[PDB]
Symmetry: C3
């Protein structure tokens, strides 16, 4: 089972480090300064074509808050298999709880893939 991955540029850290099972770390694609109580979409510099029928889950690393003072506004990001365009680059939605500077190459979040949910039928009933 493979994942085709495209990098924003030749300087981005190749996350080619994985296929053992652990969540894979993602890094800021450049320097980012976020002021307290400000929102900023941090470029992760990667675009992927996930396996058919799969999706990716993105959450911050356990040390992201302590290190950068940010939280992921959407709690857990979901990247569907259809998000495989040549320009579909990933971003980490960050809300700064304190002035913070994120350096290019800094690990800020992580992800893993999972099979999408089975097809369902939402049938309306008047009483439950």
């Amino acid at each position: 089972m493979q994942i085709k991955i495209k990098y924003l540029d030749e300087t981005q850290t190749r996350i080619n480090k994985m296929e053992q099972g652990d969540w894979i770390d993602l890094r800021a694609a450049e320097d980012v300064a976020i002021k307290k109580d400000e929102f900023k979409l941090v470029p992760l510099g990667v675009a992927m074509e996930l396996p058919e029928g799969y999706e990716a889950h993105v959450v911050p690393r356990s040390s992201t808050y302590k290190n950068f003072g940010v939280i992921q506004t959407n709690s857990m990001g979901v990247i569907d298999e259809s998000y495989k365009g040549d320009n579909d680059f990933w971003f980490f939605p960050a809300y700064a709880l304190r002035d913070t500077k994120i350096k290019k190459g800094d690990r800020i979040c992580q992800f893993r893939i999972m099979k999408k949910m089975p097809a369902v039928d939402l049938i309306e009933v008047d009483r439950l």
Copy 2:
């Protein structure tokens, strides 16, 4: 897989359509005004009987903070198969980082189902 769904009333937007595995969007059941740094349980106007052995996870949509300035206080909501009563409606626990307003019918979060955790035994030990 069949999921029985009950709606709060006829004005709630029905969400049955051709599904194929993507997360499903839920919507505010009514207008909701939230002041800066205050909390509000946003009703989603739906109650469901999930498949036996399954549970649902609920997270904000990726554009939820950008549009409404709120985060989900519980990070990811977990709805168990047992939460299937006639009055077990779903809610999105919103905390606003600014004065905001979610309009009736606005897509505000999304969900998917997943098989519940397997049978496991907990064996207490003094050392690992």
Copy 3:
């Protein structure tokens, strides 16, 4: 399957982690006071050896915000199978949105296990 659990000390409340399928509640290992807009890693007083090939996910309980006014800064904690050391204790990263006090034994979060992602091959490309 079996999960080996170690408790910090003899005064910790044994998780009543019971009910096939249900997420399991974790408790504060000691009293903790957190001032509004401040952080605090709340020890849960447990360390576990998860089944091989599995990982744990931890999120706030539905009533955590209402009860203690805190959010989990890393959104969802991810405990890998390898984090099974004798001093590999669990913590709940809490950011208080108001003055709060958590009592030893108070249930503040919950967890479940899940199979880790299948091993994947990341193939770098130049176009998607």
